[PDB]
Structure formats: structure tokens, C-alpha cells
Amino acid sequence: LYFQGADSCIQFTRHASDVLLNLNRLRSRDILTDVVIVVSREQFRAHKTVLMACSGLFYSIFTDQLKCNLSVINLDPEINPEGFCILLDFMYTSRLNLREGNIMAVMATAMYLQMEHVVDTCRKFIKASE
Ligand SMILES: O=c1[nH]c2ccc(Nc3ccc([N+](=O)[O-])cc3Cl)cc2[nH]1
Ligand SMILES: [K+]
């Protein structure tokens, strides 16, 4: 699966999603994970680079000279770990499992994590269901 990209260069259709699939496999097997995120006493292991690529909050934390070395990051204990987990899975898969029963928590968490495209999407779905 390749094509001639808009600039004559060969582009591989599945490459970016295959990279994510493989990063998610690393996460599942706890390979090269370098941070644990703590969400009201639940722990989630991840790769800092993936977090920074997806979240303004994590980008700010891991580019700070003081905080970039921390191996444990605590989030606001009001954050819903289901909400966090939905967003973490999204980061590693492109799939956002929004449901009526989780949308408010997911939106609040995405606001906290500075994930603007997700916040906007949640807003659109809320506005439609009114
Ligand atoms: O042509 C090739 N040969 C490859 C061999 C390995 C990988 N990467 C990989 C495999 C398995 C898991 N895993 O943990 O299941 C995680 C990763 Cl990152 C990619 C390849 N492309
Ligand atoms: K909580």
C-alpha cells in the first residue's frame, strides 16, 4: 500500500497507523515505557513522547527542564481514570470511544490534558444531543 504523494514522493498509506499499532504493542508489553501517570490511585504506564505528541499538558511537563526527568506524574485527583484511559487509548489508536455515559468525563479530561481537537469533537456531539 503505497502511492505517489502530492509532491511526487512515495508515501506509504498504512505507515503512520502501523507505527501507532506497534507503539501500542510496546505499551501493552511494557517495553520502553518511561513514565507512570497516576489518576486517583490508578497507575497507567506510557511513553512520554506519545503523550507529548497528543497533549498540550504533557508537552509542557516534558519540555520543562525540572519535570522532564520525573518517572511518575500525578494528575488532578478529580480526573476520572475511565476518562483518562479513553484518551490514552485514543492517543495510541486514533479511536475515541465516546458514549453518552462517558462524554462529560471525557470532555473534562481532554480539557485538562489540552487536547483541543477532542474537546471540540465532544462539544459537537453534546450540541447534537440537545
Ligand atoms: O519489517 C519489519 N520487521 C519488524 C519487526 C518488529 C517491528 N516492531 C514490533 C514488533 C512487535 C512488537 N510487539 O511488541 O508485539 C512491537 C514492535 Cl514495535 C516492526 C517490524 N517491521
Ligand atoms: K476521581
Q: How many domains does the chain have?
A: 1
Domain span at residue 44?
Answer: 1-130
**Rounded to 5, what percent of the chain is helix, strand, coil?**
50, 15, 35
The three-class DSSP label of residue 108 is helix
- In single-letter form, the type of residue at position 22 comes to N
- What cell numbers appear for 18 in the block? 502501523
Q: Which helix (H) or strand (E) segment is 94 a member of?
A: none
- What cell numbers appear for 111 in the block? 480539557
Q: Which helix (H) or strand (E) segment is 47 a member of?
A: none
- Judged on CB neighbours under 10 Å (0-12, 13-18, 19+), 15 is exposed
- How many other CB atoms are there within 10 angstroms of residue 50's CB atom? 20
Residue nearest to atom 4 of ligand 1 (CA): 22
Would you put residue 32 in left (φ > 0), alpha (ψ -120 to 50) or beta?
Answer: left
Experimental technique of record: X-ray
Q: Which helix (H) or strand (E) segment is 120 a member of?
A: helix 116-128
**Cβ–ligand 1 contact at 26 (below 6 Å):** yes
Residue nearest to atom 7 of ligand 1 (CA): 22
Place of cell 506510557: 46
Looking up residue 54, the CATH number of its domain turns out to be 3.30.710.10
- Judged on CB neighbours under 10 Å (0-12, 13-18, 19+), 100 is exposed
**Cβ–ligand 1 contact at 25 (below 6 Å):** yes
**Cβ–ligand 1 contact at 30 (below 6 Å):** no
- What cell numbers appear for 2 in the block? 503505497
Q: What is the Cα 42 distance to its own chain's centre?
A: 17
